[PDB]
Ligand binder design. Sequence first.
Ligand SMILES: [Zn+2]
Length: 46
Amino acid sequence: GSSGSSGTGEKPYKCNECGKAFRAHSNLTTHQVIHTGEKPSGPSSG
Ligand SMILES: [Zn+2]
C-alpha cells in the first residue's frame, strides 16, 4: 500500500459558477466577466 500526500494551496481561486480553477487573481477576475450580474452597484432596486 501507499501513503503520503501534501495539501498545498496553490489554487486558492476556484470559479464556483461554471466549474473552473485558476492560479492568480487577475486570471479569475478576467474570467468573472462572463459571470457578470445585473447592475451590482447599488441596492436590489426590486
Ligand atoms: Zn467561471
